[PDB]
């Protein structure tokens, strides 16, 4: 047993102290999206392509998606509705006028749950794949919120769908190595760089237009909680990034003049199914857990088939993925903020249903996300007793 | 004084264990650049414009700059030079083929100085404002170097010129909170997004065409050095980030279909002189240093006038900013990699000249970089005795 200076560092593991989410008011029901999509993109003459997009949208099990892009906005920026037209400047002007503001809606509510003054926030981690800004949205959010000008910011542009786990991994080290540090984690995502019209020669990319959506999630992360005034929800025990073998060019995205064009040539679900058991077994090794159904789950629902395959591969109870399947249905794929919507949903569900811990009665939990790499972010979570709340 | 169980954290401050630099082979003498620049862009008829560019290039106090872009490459990518055609795709293809490779050259040399196997690298921090890639250059560098697929990567896209300080600020928390962790810090920068013809620019952008250049820097950061195998060069004592008052939109870089178009509508040299004394007095507060000439200096030289202003303001010896001026004359503004270049030159110079410490004889040192915000990064450095080397 060894001891060191406390000095300017924190003592215990980093905890999630607050969670809130936000979405644009405008939304589209997935049943109505095909007819809306081919109308605003000037493609009502592509009849078979419209019918195929209808069948794609039904298989996604999505029911509602919030989007900043309205029929009005697409009219004033017709280049975004085209499949490939120079529109980065237009997409970026929308990103500048929405992404920081949407994160503010989530941060304000997350700070509200926190209950502590905003001047106590020492760090800010901001993830977005919806627009590269200089200065970034981390600066705009800091100005909109009124945070300290000396805050230590960390702007993460275009990491992909796995940046949700990357944010927690970063926040863990920031909170633990700095005594009194309170880390505002914000993931404000939108389909601004991805949205485009249908293509009779690129039908593979209609699938992405059927899943992505808009939404922001905000967390307060910190070590050494003041239990008189703060209420930990989870503990961030470990967080590891991994490049999967034989995954070259699995998810590729080129930032062109017409935004991001995601390249998906490799079967992601087969790739995850080959490696998820080994990755989760390494994350759970220190816990001693030996049953998959004795932990709570947070999986990034980027592709819906992975949820069914992972459930069948590990023989999971149909209820252990209820919160993941709820966010995918009510919100779709919000890039990196999706896993944090799922964590907030899993938290709210466990409390409202009278479960013994914020992890639905289970002590340990695993958060699993993925994106370009093929990169996987794995976070081991520890729930708190709901009686402490 | 309090004490905490060490567990899986590190005991001491983060140390710079090794550092190296790399540049593209091709370079242009600043006395030859105006004739080259206006010939390859077919602008030799704009005589009044070319004479202004000569007077601008002479004032930069630069003698050469290394650049990936050659006359053969510009002729093979005429979109980069053509005002009537988009060019972001051609620029990113060049970024994919050079930015990770340039970082590999700098990283391999730093690892050779380090002496330890690559498998002991646990974290990677990559900074670039020269190409948003998915997967990013952090993935590319990881594959080219053969680093562990389980490495904890942190890709920093398009943060601007201050990202040299940001990366040190990030590596400090990564190393100090993880015992045995070793962080590879790479900043690979180039002009692939800002380069364009002279008539395609305003006044402010024409000065950027005379200063920007290509180059990569690579450090090894880690706490608790094995003194049997490793040799610390500097210690990262503190690292803060600040937004300056009354600096809204002082530096803006808009990523468009023609590349990165910068904007500098405010007097950046005047902004720095207004706040540099107060910002550095807070960083030096726990050191007890009273005189400005009792420390070593690493100032970002993106605006050469700031060097001469800070020199007269703080009443510095002409010898103090020697290392900063050597890099500016020999390499120009290499975006975030410039300040790290200066840190390596300051080290090599102090060692070769027989100084007592790697800080040119002095104990404490400040590193100061700036970019869009107006953001200021500030690192407090502690030198080591050269007799240990």
Residue numbers in the entry:
A (entry chain A), B (entry chain E): 6 to 394
Sentences from the paper on this structure:
To investigate the role of pocket B in the catalytic reaction of PECPS, Ala210, located in the vicinity of pocket B, was substituted with a bulkier residue (Glu210), which possesses a protruding side chain that may extend into pocket B. However, the A210E mutant did not lose its catalytic activity and exhibited mostly the same 1-producing activity as that of the wild type in the HPLC experiment. The binding affinity (KD) of the A210 mutant was estimated to be 40.12 ± 4.52 μM with respect to 4-hydroxyphenylpropionyl-CoA, which was slight weaker than that of wild type PECPS (KD = 18.57 ± 1.37 μM). The crystal structure of the A210E mutant enzyme revealed that the A210E substitution eliminated pocket B observed in the wild type PECPS structure by occupying a space corresponding to pocket B with the Glu210 side chain. Other significant conformational changes between the wild type and A210E mutant were not observed in their crystal structures. The docking simulation also showed no critical movement of the side chains, including the apparent rotation of Asn199, even though the substrate and intermediate were located in the active site cavity. These results suggested that the PECPS catalytic reaction is independent of pocket B.
In this work, we demonstrated that PECs in agarwood are biosynthesized from a common precursor featuring a C6–C5–C6 skeleton produced by a diarylpentanoid-producing polyketide synthase, hereafter named 2-(2-phenylethyl)chromone precursor synthase (PECPS). The last remaining candidate gene encodes a PKS (PECPS) sharing high amino acid sequence identity with the other four PKSs, as well as the highest 93% similarity with AsCHS1, and this gene maintains the Cys-His-Asn catalytic triad conserved in all known type III PKSs. The crystal structure of PECPS showed typical homodimeric type III PKS folding. Crystal structure analyses suggested that PECPS utilizes unique one-pot catalytic machinery that includes the release of a diketide-CoA intermediate, which has never been reported in other known type III PKSs.
